[PDB]
Each structure stands twice: as structure tokens, then as C-alpha cells.
């Protein structure tokens, strides 16, 4: 049995969902099919380009598990609501408030206006220029965060970015890192 990994981005282009799949195994030089519970369709044929397979269609069922069988090579019984990949947040910004001596971090996500995946949990990771791959992480539920000036190194530059997860009825994967943002701190 050959191994693979899939993820489904829901409520992307309007309501058209996109289920992408790729192989776990390193070398698979073949000179892929997923069926299961759907709506208006019984089984659909993936599109083939390089090593990724997705379809963009509106007739999709969110309820019920589906058997994904590779062509029959390998089968996996997975739920469409347990392989969700949110869209990466965007418009990340940090603003220093001189009066309160703090930094307000703000971002946006197209999922807020989505019907199904509307509850997310975001992870904001920020690091200093000097540190070799050390990140301070903060989990949050809103879209705004406040970092105290006293809890930050003075006269230092910080890079910052954010990820998201379904954290309600839906489960899945973490999104991609948003484009980073950079900000400085006053010199005491």
C-alpha cells in the first residue's frame, strides 16, 4: 500500500471546495481517484499536473465520511470536515501606541465571512533579528493582540507572523504563514 496525504480547503472560491492530495512516499515515478459520500456526484476524477490533484466544483457534501482509494491501490476512510486547511491570514500590521507603551497587532482572514468554517484559533509567532530560529508564540481567538513594551527588548527589531486552525466543529491542518511584518522598539 502506497502512502499519501490530503487536505481540503472549504469555502474558497465562493462555495466551491478544493480537495488536494500528494504522496508521502519519496519516489513514486508512475508512467489518483477519490470516491465516497458526496452530493449530486458519486465519484469524480482528479486533475493531474505534477504531483497535486484537486477539483473545483460546487456540488460537495460536507456531511459523511468518504473512502479515498488510489488507482484500486490504497484506501483511506477520511471525513471531509477533518482535513480542512484554512486560508492564510493577511494584512498583518503592528502599531506602537506611545501613550500606553505597547504594540497592537492586527490581521484579517477571509474565513470570518464564511458560512461553514467561521471559528478559528490563530497562532502569532514573533522573533527578534538576533535569535537563530527562536520564536515567541501566542494563541488567540480574536483578531487583535497587545504586546507590552516592558515585556519586549528595547531598541530591538521584531519580525512577526500568524497562522490559523479550525477550532470548533471542523478539524484539519494549520494554514501557511502570513507575510511577515517588522517593527522596532524605542531605546528606553
Amino acid at each position: 500500500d502506497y502512502s499519501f496525504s490530503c487536505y481540503s480547503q472549504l469555502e474558497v472560491n465562493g462555495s466551491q471546495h478544493s480537495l488536494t492530495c500528494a504522496f508521502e512516499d519519496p519516489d513514486v515515478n508512475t508512467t489518483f481517484e477519490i470516491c465516497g459520500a458526496l452530493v449530486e456526484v458519486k465519484c469524480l476524477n482528479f486533475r493531474k499536473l505534477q504531483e497535486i490533484y484537486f477539483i473545483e466544483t460546487k456540488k460537495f457534501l460536507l456531511i459523511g465520511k468518504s473512502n479515498i482509494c488510489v488507482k484500486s491501490l490504497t484506501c483511506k476512510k477520511i471525513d471531509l470536515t477533518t482535513i480542512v486547511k484554512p486560508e492564510a491570514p493577511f494584512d498583518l500590521s503592528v502599531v506602537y501606541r506611545e501613550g500606553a507603551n505597547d504594540f497592537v497587532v492586527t490581521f484579517n482572514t477571509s474565513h470570518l465571512q464564511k458560512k461553514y468554517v467561521k471559528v478559528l484559533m490563530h497562532d502569532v509567532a514573533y522573533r527578534q533579528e538576533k535569535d537563530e530560529n527562536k520564536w515567541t508564540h501566542v494563541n488567540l481567538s480574536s483578531t487583535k493582540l497587545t504586546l507590552l513594551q516592558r515585556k519586549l527588548q528595547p531598541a530591538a527589531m521584531y519580525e512577526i507572523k500568524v497562522r490559523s486552525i479550525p477550532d470548533h466543529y471542523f478539524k484539519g491542518f494549520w494554514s501557511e504563514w502570513s507575510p511577515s511584518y517588522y517593527f522596532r522598539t524605542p531605546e528606553i
Epitope: 494584512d91 500590521s93 502599531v95 506602537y96 497592537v104 484579517n108 507575510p179 517593527f183 522596532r184 524605542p186
Partner: antibody
Framework: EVQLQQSGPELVKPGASVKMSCKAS????????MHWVKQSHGKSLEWIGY????????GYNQKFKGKATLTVDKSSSTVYMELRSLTSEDSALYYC?????????????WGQGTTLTVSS | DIVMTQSHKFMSTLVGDRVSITCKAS??????VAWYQQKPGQSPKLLIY???YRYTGVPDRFTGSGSGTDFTFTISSVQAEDLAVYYC?????????FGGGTKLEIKR
């Protein structure tokens, strides 16, 4: 003192592309964000996007397909490209501005602006 | 986008008089609002940041107040050279959005 010298006025045909320059001088060019702003006929100010000279950036949804910002530290120049020019990007004066030290939030220095005109 | 709306597009005042331009935000932007001054034939000049903080070299007669959604820029004693369009900009989140502007005419 700080100086942001922008390129001269431009005349372009519809559908063609434009490339404006903004040469900075008088400060450490790599430590400050660089933003672009549009001033339409109605005197309204529309942000365009930001770029950090050490690497890069972009912003604003409305200018995603129109604006393309880049930088060159060697000449300390921020360049700004327009793609599918229309009769709306014309009656606009394009400014380059510098974001303040701690953040690019607000802009403390402005260029003189470039007048763009796209007409057959 | 966060929409900034300036109530009055034109304002007239006498020299030595007070003027207060208002600017309302569609969402809460805390105290992070800046005010720019654009004189005829010139580029915008940053006068105020963070609602009430004056930029370096800005005269003291320019002041600012407000928080959340309502903000007010005030000239305590308008002078002849104060002729300009005054803009409010929320420097709180992305995208950065400006106000419509308010042209300050002088009555004589």
C-alpha cells in the same frame, strides 16, 4: 536633511505600463518602510502599498493587480510599476512616503509626487 | 477596509479664530489616528500622530483629541499660512485608509 526625489511626469498609452522612481537620501535607507500613495482628481488619498528595503512587501487589495513595488539598496531607490493602465490611474498624483521609525503606520516624509497621464 | 469620514468638506474661519475638524472611523481604531496638512501646491505634511501627539517641529497651536471612532483636530489660532486641506488617517491596521479631507478657507 531627508530627501525623497521622485521621477518626472509621465505620459503613457492605455494598456501599457509605467515605472516611477523614488530616490531616498539623507538617512539610513534600509531602516524605514517605504509606502506609495495615490491622489486622485477629487483630492482623496489612497494608500497603495508598503515595501521594506531589506527584503520586500506589498499591500492593499485594490492595487494588487495594478501596483508592483520593488527596491534597490545600491542606489537607495524604491521603484513602482503600473501594469494595465486605465483612464482612472491617470488623474492621480503618485507620492512616495517614508513610514516612521518604529512602524510604517503613519508617514513622516513625502516626495514631491509624479503626475501620470495615460491617453491615446 | 476601515472607512474614515470627515464631516465637512469645506470650512471657513477668521485669522486668530479657532477651528475643529472632526473625523469618524467605521471601526474602533483606539488612539492611533494621524492628521496631515497639505498646503496649495505642496505635499502632505505630517502634523499629528496617535490622535493627540504632535510631530517634531509642529507648532503648538495644532492639537488633536479623540479615541475609538471619534477624533478632532483643532487649530487654536488660525493663521494665514494655515490654508490647506487637512486629512485624517487611521494608522491602526492594514489597509491604511485616509479621510476625504477638509479644505480650510480663510475669511477676510
Amino acid at each position: 536633511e531627508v530627501q525623497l526625489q521622485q521621477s518626472g511626469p509621465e505620459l503613457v498609452k492605455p494598456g501599457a505600463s509605467v515605472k516611477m522612481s523614488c530616490k531616498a537620501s539623507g538617512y539610513t535607507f534600509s531602516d524605514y518602510y517605504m509606502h506609495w500613495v495615490k491622489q486622485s482628481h477629487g483630492k482623496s488619498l489612497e494608500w497603495i502599498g508598503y515595501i521594506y528595503p531589506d527584503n520586500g512587501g506589498n499591500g492593499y487589495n485594490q492595487k494588487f493587480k495594478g501596483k508592483a513595488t520593488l527596491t534597490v539598496d545600491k542606489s537607495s531607490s524604491t521603484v513602482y510599476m503600473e501594469l494595465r493602465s486605465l483612464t482612472s490611474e491617470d488623474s492621480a498624483l503618485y507620492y512616495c512616503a517614508r513610514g516612521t521609525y518604529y512602524d510604517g503606520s503613519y508617514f513622516d516624509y513625502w516626495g514631491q509626487g509624479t503626475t501620470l497621464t495615460v491617453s491615446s | 477596509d476601515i472607512v474614515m469620514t470627515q464631516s465637512h468638506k469645506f470650512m471657513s474661519t477668521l485669522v486668530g479664530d479657532r477651528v475643529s475638524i472632526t473625523c469618524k472611523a467605521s471601526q474602533d481604531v483606539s488612539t492611533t489616528v494621524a492628521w496631515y496638512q497639505q498646503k496649495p501646491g505642496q505635499s502632505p505634511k505630517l502634523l499629528i500622530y496617535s490622535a493627540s501627539y504632535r510631530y517634531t517641529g509642529v507648532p503648538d497651536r495644532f492639537t488633536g483629541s479623540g479615541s475609538g471612532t471619534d477624533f478632532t483636530f483643532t487649530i487654536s489660532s488660525v493663521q494665514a499660512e494655515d490654508l490647506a486641506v487637512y486629512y485624517c488617517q487611521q494608522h491602526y491596521s492594514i489597509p491604511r485608509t485616509f479621510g476625504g479631507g477638509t479644505k480650510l478657507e480663510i475669511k477676510r
